[PDB]
Each structure stands twice: as C-alpha cells, then as structure tokens.
Write an enzyme that holds these catalytic residues in place. Structure first.
Site, mmCIF file in Angstrom:
data_model
loop_
_atom_site.group_PDB
_atom_site.id
_atom_site.type_symbol
_atom_site.label_atom_id
_atom_site.label_comp_id
_atom_site.label_asym_id
_atom_site.label_seq_id
_atom_site.Cartn_x
_atom_site.Cartn_y
_atom_site.Cartn_z
ATOM 1 C CB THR A 12 -0.720 0.082 1.388
ATOM 2 O OG1 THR A 12 -1.802 1.449 1.481
ATOM 3 C CG2 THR A 12 -0.180 0.278 2.641
ATOM 4 N N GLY A 13 -0.076 2.160 -0.815
ATOM 5 C CA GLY A 13 0.813 3.366 -0.393
ATOM 6 C C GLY A 13 2.123 3.367 -1.579
ATOM 7 C CE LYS A 38 -8.426 2.439 -5.528
ATOM 8 N NZ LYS A 38 -7.411 2.381 -5.143
ATOM 9 N N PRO A 39 -12.704 -1.767 -8.798
ATOM 10 C CG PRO A 39 -11.712 -3.021 -8.750
ATOM 11 C CD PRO A 39 -11.300 -2.123 -9.609
ATOM 12 N N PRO A 198 8.894 9.694 -11.943
ATOM 13 C CG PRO A 198 9.130 12.066 -12.736
ATOM 14 C CD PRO A 198 8.540 10.735 -13.162
HETATM 15 O O1 LIG Z 1 -5.177 1.766 -2.016
HETATM 16 C C1 LIG Z 1 -4.433 1.834 -1.217
HETATM 17 O O2 LIG Z 1 -3.081 0.917 -1.144
HETATM 18 C C2 LIG Z 1 -4.487 2.840 -0.040
HETATM 19 C C3 LIG Z 1 -5.851 2.343 1.017
HETATM 20 C C4 LIG Z 1 -5.569 3.792 1.190
HETATM 21 C C5 LIG Z 1 -6.546 3.169 3.269
HETATM 22 C C6 LIG Z 1 -6.980 2.162 3.068
HETATM 23 C C7 LIG Z 1 -5.119 1.512 1.862
HETATM 24 C C8 LIG Z 1 -5.662 0.493 0.757
HETATM 25 O O3 LIG Z 1 -6.523 0.084 0.121
HETATM 26 C C9 LIG Z 1 -5.045 -0.979 2.131
HETATM 27 C C10 LIG Z 1 -5.551 -2.267 1.059
HETATM 28 C C11 LIG Z 1 -4.878 -3.686 1.730
HETATM 29 C C12 LIG Z 1 -4.169 -3.177 3.329
HETATM 30 C C13 LIG Z 1 -3.641 -4.499 3.768
HETATM 31 O O4 LIG Z 1 -3.209 -5.836 2.563
HETATM 32 O O5 LIG Z 1 -2.728 -5.008 4.854
HETATM 33 C C14 LIG Z 1 -3.573 -1.915 3.772
HETATM 34 C C15 LIG Z 1 -4.214 -1.068 3.160
#
Ligand SMILES: O=C(O)C[C@@H]1CCC[C@H]1C(=O)c1ccc(C(=O)O)cc1
Ligand SMILES: O=C(O)C[C@@H]1CCC[C@H]1C(=O)c1ccc(C(=O)O)cc1
Lengths: 227, 226
Positions: A12-13, A38-39, A198
C-alpha cells in the site's frame, strides 16, 4: 474486446494511483482510448478517491467505480467497520468487462497489494485478472524491502499464470542513494522496469504530468499494449 | 536431530531479530537448549549484529554465523558492493545441520523477507528451510499493509511445502489504534498468532526482556517445540 491491465503493487502507498494516471496519460497521448476502473475504494471518509486523482492528473473521463467504504483500511476491514459487505466476484468482473472494448486500454487499479481481498470469500485482484484474462502491472518502490515484496508478488502472479506486464517504480528519487540504485538494477533483473516515475510525480499539473508520462514509458511498449 | 525453525518476516525491519531473541528467551525459560544461526549479516559498518542482540536479550551462547557485510543492504547487494560472493548454499545448510541436535531449538534467521537471496546462486531462506526440513515462523507487523505481505509470504511457504509455525507481531503498539487492532484479528484469521511483542521490547534489558518473552508466548506451544 481490448486490453485489460490490472495495476497492482507490492503493498500500500507504493504508487498504484500515480502509475495508473501516468500510464493512462501515456496511452492517451499515443491515441489509445483509456478507461480507469477502481472496483474497491476505501478511505472515502478522508477524501481518498483514486478515480478522481487519475482524472485530475491524466484527464481520463472514463472513470468507473463500484464499492466505496469510508475508513482508510483494507477493503475487508473498512466494509465490516461500515456495516457493509464487499462486492461479489462477478460484480467486479462485470464492471471491467462492461468497460472493455477493442482499441481501449482498461486499467483496473487494485486496493493495496495483489493478495488483498476485494470480494467474498478471499477473492483478490489476481483472481479477477484470471477471470478477465488481464496482465498485471506491478507497482514497486525503490526503498529497502522492495526486492522481497516484488519477488513475492511475481511468484503469486505466476502461481495463477497471470502474466506480468512488468514493474513500475512509483517514486524515483532525484538523486538516488546507494540502495535506490542497487534496487533499480536488481528489479530490472527480475522483471522489465516499464518506467521509473520521478518522485513527486503526483504534485505535477496536467501538462507537467503529461510530459513526465510521455517520457516515463517506452512509447513502443505503450503503443504495443492495444491493437 | 532436534527442532529447526527458520524465523523469517514479511519484510525488513519487521522485528525478526527481536522475535528470535524473544522466542529463544521463552524457550530457554522452558529448559530448552537454543541455538540461533544467522548465516549472513549486513549493515555491520553501522553496528548491526543480530546475534549479539539475541545473546544480550536472551542469553543464547550458541550463536552461529558465516558472513558479515558492512553495507546496510540486502545480502546480494552488500556482497556486490563488497566484491565478495555470498556464502555457499552448502555452507549454510551444513552449518545449520551441525547446529541441530536433539533437545535443542535451533532458530535460523534470514535477512529481510522470505525470498531474499542468501547464498550462491539465488538461494533463499525458503530453499534452506526445505533442505533442513525446517518449518517457518513468520514475523509480521501490525501496520497498514501487513495483510497482503503476510498472505504473500504464507503462499510462498506453501508453494514449497514449508510448514508455517505461525505468526508473531514484532511490535504491538500502545495504544493499538483502529488499524493495528483490526489487523491483529485479520492476521489471526490467516494463521496462528503466537505472540505480539510490545513496542520497544528491543530496548529492554536482559531481565525485563526475559520477563516480557516468558509472557509473550504460550508456555505449552514453546515447550512443545522440541
Ligand atoms: O489503495 C491503497 O493501497 C491505499 C488504501 C488507503 C487506506 C487503505 C489503503 C488500502 O487499500 C489497503 C489495502 C490492503 C492493506 C493490507 O494488506 O494490509 C492495507 C491497506
Ligand atoms: O531485514 C533485516 O534484517 C535488516 C537488514 C539490515 C541491512 C539491510 C536489511 C536487509 O537485510 C534487507 C534484506 C532484503 C531487502 C529487500 O527485500 O529489498 C532489504 C533489506
């Protein structure tokens, strides 16, 4: 139909949304019709809206969403926290196929990493990719830890014969440290690095972003995604 | 022989070392002989010594290593930068087998996550768990992202018929928070959560840490490892 690519990441991130917008823009500039889908979108109670950001940065108008949950949590947790259920497997697949048409690049942005649950019971983006015969574009980081996460993801893709369309580095620092460079070279040895966006790519405006996007990707690989 | 356990993690900095020391300390407090093998160690320029930590925190004396690199990088990149190959697959497997003896819990700690290269050529801690018929303990975080990483790591284990001895959360925060507490339940749905080491447990002195470790794991699970 056309070409469906699931855009996942190691975690994530890591830059899935900015890579989505950046690939979308590069394809649009090559005259490819693009839809971004974005399902499952969590985090709406803090303004997260990846579809919105993708349109903002790449000018995609064809933006399809489905399930939205308030809490910034894994799809499965944010749903329980909201008293809501996850979508069903064949609802995500329906959302994508309805977008799929020839001459179009349809990008399916996941939530978190590849094995995150999106539908009951244990349905992941990888399963979706199988269901709709999509390759996966894996978003990776340059930071310490990326090599194990990427290798895991690729193995999990291969375990279901989901073809890897390559990696994208979501954020590439200017200039790179010793680790950053080492990772980039090692990443290139385990898969093709389609681009290295970048650092700060998402703060760019329309034209800065479109130029960055046109430069990031090999024109001939992008053009080759859709016939 | 005895019981060999590789201690791996979803990634880097997730608490692999503190968990070895903790499980070593709890297993020692159950009268189990404990050896810890750290084949490849990096970041030695800045003071990294995971076997020293296990020694200090847990009192383990059988502490076995083959290679040290100064660069705080993954083994293949620290060795690249250093100009010297990683140890041989044979050296690692044989070191661990020589360590293994009946009545002893031999812990094997990797570098980074499960699929990191540790030996020539492209040998991972997964390959080593195979060769010495060891099960894996998987260290995980409580933080956002941990679920995907854990599910990825467990899959990679199953794909090579390496058994999963469970999960340990390496740093349980105080106070939890919504995501940590939701992750802890979710993780427990994925595999047995054997322990959640309190944040800051690595800064404990030996006696404190021992008391923590005695209390972090189930007495019976630990005793039943050998
Ligand atoms: O789309 C993102 O990755 C950012 C989103 C923002 C908030 C929750 C993020 C999320 O979906 C997510 C999905 C799976 C897990 C995990 O496997 O622990 C953690 C976070
Ligand atoms: O994990 C540790 O034990 C801490 C160590 C200290 C130096 C760098 C850490 C390391 O070995 C490592 C292993 C793999 C990866 C990767 O997958 O990219 C990154 C770092």
């Amino acid at each position: 139909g056309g070409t469906i690519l699931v855009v996942t990441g190691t975690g994530t991130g890591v830059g899935k949304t900015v890579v989505c917008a950046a690939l979308a823009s590069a394809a649009r500039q090559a005259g490819i019709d693009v839809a971004v889908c974005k399902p499952v979108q969590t985090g709406t109670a803090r303004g997260d809206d990846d579809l919105a950001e993708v349109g903002r940065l790449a000018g995609v108008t064809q933006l399809a969403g489905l399930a939205r949950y308030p809490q910034p949590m894994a799809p499965a947790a944010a749903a329980e926290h909201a008293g809501m259920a996850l979508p069903a497997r064949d609802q995500i697949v329906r959302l994508i196929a309805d977008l799929d048409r020839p001459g179009r690049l349809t990008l399916v942005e996941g939530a978190g990493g590849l094995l995150v649950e999106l539908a009951e019971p244990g349905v992941t983006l990888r399963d979706v990719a199988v269901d709709v015969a999509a390759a996966a574009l894996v978003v990776v980081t340059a930071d310490l830890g990326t090599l194990n996460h990427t290798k895991l993801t690729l193995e999990a893709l291969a375990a279901q014969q989901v073809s890897c369309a390559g990696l994208v580095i979501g954020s590439w620092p200017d200039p790179p440290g010793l680790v950053a460079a080492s990772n980039r070279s090692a990443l290139a040895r385990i898969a093709m690095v389609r681009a290295a966006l970048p650092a700060g790519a998402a703060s760019l405006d329309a034209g800065d972003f479109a130029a960055m996007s046109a430069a990031a990707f090999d024109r001939n690989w992008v053009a080759g995604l859709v016939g």
